[PDB]
């Protein structure tokens, strides 16, 4: 009857950048989502597979909780089957997704008038990302012209570019935080 | 909240000795603990950030270690002018919260 860490992952300080999405594995708890229901600013509480109202008295198992920071426009890509840059190179959900995708408007917290070049995302990769796997490889992407062996220049590109995250960009460019609960619906461990 | 218990509450050392302080957390904080020093009736200052890295400007004796939920700040070759109350202040989850604070007096 011990609550499980929805506190440690929701009101936390530093969400890690998107190309390395920190992944917390929840187990052996009683997850009360009425703690989230009260917190209103949630820009998009979109649940794919279950409906939020019938979500409390269920009993999940093997529930994960990812987290990252992405542009305000690129928030519409954390969803099953989406196409673009984030879900093809950073974080992709499978076609049979059975969880939820929550979002913030974190312009108060992660935005300095100096260039917040601290968060990054992946720009170039050989192949598309398999579902639910990350790539922290820091090495040059290039067509088979000449292996520059870690030198930036012509036809050699450092993969991880950085966001701007200025507090004057716009509702569509300021950083949005995202938490992706992915249930696995074996004995049920969590409940309400 | 993440309540940080500091032990011991009282201390008794003499100049020229080595002594270590202790501030264990309650939840898992990824080495996001800082250590503060406050003397008698003054603004508390910063000793070491992230529980292991030092602040340019402090003496070369304060140095703490520990990662996870058990942290220790050990001051060696203590000088009598280092008297004061020491505060640990985590930074992982919200709201940020300091410990009760222990006092390091003389004999």
């Amino acid at each position, epitope marked *: 009857t011990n609550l499980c860490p929805f506190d440690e992952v929701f009101n936390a300080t530093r969400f890690a950048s998107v190309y390395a999405w920190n992944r917390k594995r929840i187990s052996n708890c009683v997850a009360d989502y009425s703690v989230l229901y009260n917190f209103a600013p949630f820009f998009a509480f979109k649940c794919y597979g279950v409906s939020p109202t019938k979500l409390n008295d269920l009993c999940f198992t093997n529930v994960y909780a990812d987290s990252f920071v992405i542009r305000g426009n690129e928030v519409s890509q954390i969803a099953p089957g989406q196409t673009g840059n984030i879900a093809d190179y950073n974080y992709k959900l499978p076609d049979d997704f059975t969880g939820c995708v929550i979002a913030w408007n974190s312009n108060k*917290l992660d935005s*300095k008038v100096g260039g917040n070049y601290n968060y990054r995302y992946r720009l170039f990769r050989k192949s598309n990302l398999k579902p639910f796997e990350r790539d922290i490889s820091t090495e040059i992407y290039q067509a088979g012209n000449k292996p520059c062996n870690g030198v930036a220049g012509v036809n050699c590109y450092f993969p991880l570019q950085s966001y701007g995250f200025r507090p004057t960009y716009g509702v569509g460019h300021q950083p949005y935080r995202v938490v992706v609960l992915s249930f696995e619906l074996a004995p049920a461990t969590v409940c309400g | 909240d993440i309540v940080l218990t500091q032990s011991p509450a009282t201390l008794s050392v003499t100049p020229g000795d080595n002594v270590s302080l202790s501030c264990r957390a309650s939840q898992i904080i990824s080495n996001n603990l800082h250590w503060y020093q406050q003397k008698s009736h003054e603004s508390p*200052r910063l000793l070491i950030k992230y529980a292991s890295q030092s602040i340019s400007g402090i003496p070369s004796r304060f140095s703490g270690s520990g990662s996870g939920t058990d942290f220790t700040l050990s001051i060696n070759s203590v000088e009598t002018e280092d008297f004061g109350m020491y505060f640990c202040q985590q930074s992982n989850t919200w709201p940020l919260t*300091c410990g009760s604070g222990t006092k390091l007096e003389l004999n």
Partner: nanobody, 119 residues
Framework: QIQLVQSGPELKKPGETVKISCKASGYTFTDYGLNWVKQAPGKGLKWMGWINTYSGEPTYNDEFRGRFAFSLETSTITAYLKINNLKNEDTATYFC????????????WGAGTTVTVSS
């Protein structure tokens, strides 16, 4: 030169209001936040909740939700703190420390303003 000079000590009656100043100067005010700390005599520090120095929208610690207001003016580079309905319990010394917007460690503090209540 980096400093945050506050207002002098206060003394008010139960029910009155107070405005405490925290005037920052020396560093670019926008590149950091501002945190407030309340220290009752004989106990530990308490984080009162930061305020984004560019916009000014506060974030109250869930204990000091009401009765406190972190107003901010940016013409003159001075933050504020305003308490309504002073009670018999909040006698303490109120700091204001520049905690960053990405690190959150209070390096440069203020001198410390004291607020006591009496009849």
């Amino acid at each position: 030169q980096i400093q945050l000079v506050q207002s002098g000590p206060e003394l008010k009656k139960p029910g009155e209001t107070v405005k405490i100043s925290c005037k920052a100067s020396g560093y670019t005010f926008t590149d950091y936040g501002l945190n407030w700390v309340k220290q009752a005599p004989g106990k530990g520090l308490k984080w009162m909740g930061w305020i984004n120095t560019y916009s000014g929208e506060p974030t109250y610690n869930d204990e000091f939700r009401g009765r406190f207001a972190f107003s901010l003016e940016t013409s003159t580079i001075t933050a504020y703190l305003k308490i309504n309905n002073l009670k018999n319990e909040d006698t303490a010394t109120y700091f204001c420390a520049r905690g960053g917007n990405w690190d959150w460690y209070f390096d440069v503090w203020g001198a410390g303003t004291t607020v006591t209540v009496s009849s």
